[PDB]
Amino acid sequence: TYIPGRLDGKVALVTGSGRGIGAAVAVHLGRLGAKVVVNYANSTKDAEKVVSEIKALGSDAIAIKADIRQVPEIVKLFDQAVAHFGHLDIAVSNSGVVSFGHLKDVTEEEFDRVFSLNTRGQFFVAREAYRHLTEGGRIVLTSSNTSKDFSVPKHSLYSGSKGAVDSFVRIFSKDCGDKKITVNAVAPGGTVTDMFHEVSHHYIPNGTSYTAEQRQQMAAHASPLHRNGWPQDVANVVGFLVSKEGEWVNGKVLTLDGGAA
């Protein structure tokens, strides 16, 4: 019985959904009615927990291990999703890594560590999603507010990895149009996950000398709403984008920073 904004009958796949923004995204698509493929690379136990979380709320989920840096595994990841659930309608490219360093000291190895996942990875998730998805499908990739809207010292490598994503999705929308598939990206600001705590200090002048609580409480004042971004905030937006009602939002980056910018 079709409820506006619900994903009953649909099958969704979220990369890196064992934990973080991706876990919230994966559970949320489950609450909306979708069956979900929970992708992980390292966090087996957390992915299990997401699968259980989704089954308990009246849906179905499977956990598939795949390093998204390896394109042959993306291909296999999408092949397995379609095999198991019958068809795939929604792909969310979420997996990502963070990076900091003054330009002068950025190494080749660090460049490739970051770009092979954030950019090359998301790119081929997009290719494999286009190849496997049903007509009228949905593809969301993950950018960041540091791509265009926010300028952070020593953050050039990461910012550019996502700036690439920002261009990808606008043109992806053109190509993917012949399968009636919309492509967008979400570009979150400070969102409280393990990534956030790992680096909150790089975003603030003399941040090492503040606590982890105090730093989070400063990031909260960036938005005029005076609160942090939460994995749920992204999930709410991804959830609209991937519904029937979000169709006319296509080829776009949505900055999700609560009005910081």
Ligand X SMILES: NC(=O)c1ccc[n+]([C@@H]2O[C@H](COP(=O)([O-])OP(=O)(O)OC[C@H]3O[C@@H](n4cnc5c(N)ncnc54)[C@H](OP(=O)(O)O)[C@@H]3O)[C@@H](O)[C@H]2O)c1
The binding site for NADP(+) consists of 16, 19, 21, 41-43, 67-68, 94-96, 158, 162, 191, 193, 195
* Binding partner of 193, given a second copy, ligand KMP, ligand X, none, CB within 5-8 angstroms per partner class: ligand X
Minimal distance in Å, beta carbon 149 to a second copy? 10
Burial of 210 (0-12, 13-18, 19+ CB in 10 A): middle
- Of positions 99, 119, 184, 191, contacts ligand X by CB under 6 A: 191
Hey, which residues between 165 and 184 contact a second copy (CB under 8 A)?
165-168, 170-172, 174-176
Hey, which residues between 161 and 190 contact ligand X (CB under 6 A)?
188, 190
| Nearest residue to 139 via CA among 178, 174, 89, 67 | 89
Does 16 contact ligand KMP by CB under 6 A? no
Q: CA-CA distance, 68 to 125, in Å (whole number)?
A: 8
Residue number, nearest CB to ligand KMP? 190
Give yes or no for a contact between 126 and 143, defined as CB atoms under 8 angstroms apart. Answer: no
* Binding partner of 203, given ligand X, ligand KMP, a second copy, none, CB within 5-8 angstroms per partner class: ligand KMP
Residue (102 or 197) nearer to a second copy, CB: 102
Active-site choice (147, 162, 200, 203): 162
Give yes or no for a contact between 145 and 188, defined as CB atoms under 8 angstroms apart. Answer: yes
Binding characters for ligand KMP, 116-145, by CB under 6 A (x = yes): ----------------------------xx
- Of positions 10, 28, 35, 155, contacts a second copy by CB under 8 A: 155
Q: Is 243 a catalytic residue?
A: no
Q: CA-CA distance, 131 to 170, in Å (whole number)?
A: 18
Handedness of CA 5, 8, 13, 18 (dihedral sign): positive
* Cβ within 8 Å of residue 9, ≥6 positions away: 33
* Binding partner of 33, given a second copy, ligand KMP, ligand X, none, CB within 5-8 angstroms per partner class: none
Does 200 contact ligand KMP by CB under 6 A? yes
Q: Is 59 a catalytic residue?
A: no
| Structural gaps in the chain: residues followed by a C–N separation over 2.5 Å | none
Does 95 contact ligand X by CB under 6 A? yes
Phi/psi of residue 234, nearest 5 degrees:
-70, -45
Give yes or no for a contact between 214 and 245, defined as CB atoms under 8 angstroms apart. Answer: no
Can you list the positions of beta strands (E) in the chain? 11-14, 35-40, 61-65, 88-92, 133-142, 182-188, 253-256
Which residues contribute to the site for ligand KMP (CB under 6 A)? 144-146, 189-190, 196, 199-200, 203-204, 215, 218-219, 222
